[PDB]
């Protein structure tokens, strides 16, 4: 399977399919100690999964570009999704999306 359509479970750990988390541009950023192991089995996954773009939405909202180097060809995506401030779950998503964003600097 192509790397952009691989699901992460307790068998394929998140670092085992999407690469190690780090500061580099290609490398990912999201994820904390619990998420990189449990995967989609993480207990509060659906609440953070309500922000995953669908097939059409990803193309319809994100800005796409093609960058070509002697290394090959890459598709660059720049997206921006707003979070509703009226829904009662507003104080359920900010905490989840703060404990996990940029959490690789805290690992030993």
């Amino acid at each position, epitope marked *: 399977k192509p790397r952009q359509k691989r699901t992460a479970t307790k068998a394929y750990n998140v670092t085992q399919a999407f690469g190690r988390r780090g500061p580099e541009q290609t490398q990912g950023n999201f994820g904390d100690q619990e998420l990189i192991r449990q995967g989609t089995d993480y*207990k*509060h996954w659906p609440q953070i999964a309500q922000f995953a773009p669908s097939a059409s939405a990803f193309f319809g909202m994100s800005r796409i570009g093609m960058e070509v180097t002697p290394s090959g060809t890459w598709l660059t995506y720049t997206g921006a999704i707003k979070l509703d401030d009226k829904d009662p779950n507003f*104080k*359920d998503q*900010v*905490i*989840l999306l*703060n*404990k996990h*964003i*940029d*959490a690789y*600097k*805290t690992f030993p």
Partner: antibody, heavy 115, light 107 residues
Framework: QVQLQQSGPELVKPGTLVKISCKAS????????INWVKQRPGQGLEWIGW????????KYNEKFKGKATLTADTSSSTAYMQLNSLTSENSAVYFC??????????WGQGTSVTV | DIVMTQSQKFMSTSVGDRVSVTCKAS??????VAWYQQKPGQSPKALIY???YRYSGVPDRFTGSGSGTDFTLTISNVQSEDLAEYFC?????????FGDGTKLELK
């Protein structure tokens, strides 16, 4: 709204096992995590652990491993705790609160022990 | 184990002024800290989560700022219903700390 009722005061003899219960209501029980904390008179708060009434996961803190034993009861949305140190050094009050990943959202009246 | 330390165990103030406290963390904890209030002889109530956002029911004039090391809670126009003890908690590396305590008094 959201309320977490806890039992009343409890005066116990040293060593004699205790049991502190807190009943939850007004929210989906298996949707949020229940944690505990202690507060010695004068000193500051310090973490104990949490319990999630799903897979029964329970991650204690290093200091109180084996000293506390959390349980869950989804039949009546009630979680209780058993302490077995009781050395007149833990003569304090306890608070049973909620939380998403640790950030405590609401609280309860708590209990009070005395050796 | 991360240690979160405060200062000014006693800090009185005046009514309707600008008072702010500080809370320094030893290890970097990104932006996941929370500030709590507790009036004497009552249970704590949550003031601020994610170091910037305010819970529902919590009034205005209670703002938070900071990232990484120095977290600050700023209260404006201090009123009578503010005499209490204030705490800060970290959430990046279990186990969790609760600070020591900041009593807010009058003068």
């Amino acid at each position: 709204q959201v309320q977490l009722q806890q039992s009343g005061p409890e005066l116990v003899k040293p060593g004699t096992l205790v049991k502190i219960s807190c009943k939850a209501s007004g929210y989906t029980f298996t949707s949020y995590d229940i944690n505990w904390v202690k507060q010695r008179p004068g000193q500051g708060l310090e973490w104990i652990g949490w319990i999630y009434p799903g897979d029964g996961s329970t991650k204690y803190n290093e200091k109180f491993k084996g000293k506390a034993t959390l349980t869950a009861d989804t039949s009546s949305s009630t979680a209780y705790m058993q302490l077995n140190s009781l050395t007149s050094e833990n003569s304090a009050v306890y608070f049973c609160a909620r939380g998403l990943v640790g950030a405590m959202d609401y609280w309860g009246q708590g209990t009070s022990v005395t050796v | 184990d991360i240690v979160m330390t405060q200062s000014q165990k006693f800090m009185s103030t005046s009514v309707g002024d600008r008072v702010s406290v500080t809370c320094k963390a030893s290890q970097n904890v990104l932006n996941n800290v929370a500030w709590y209030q507790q009036k004497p002889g009552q249970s704590p109530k949550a003031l601020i989560y994610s170091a910037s956002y305010r819970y529902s029911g919590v009034p205005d004039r209670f703002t938070g700022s900071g990232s990484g090391t120095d977290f600050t809670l700023t209260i404006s126009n201090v009123q009578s219903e503010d005499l209490a003890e204030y705490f800060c908690q970290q959430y990046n590396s279990y186990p969790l700390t609760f600070g020591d305590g900041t009593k807010l008094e009058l003068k």
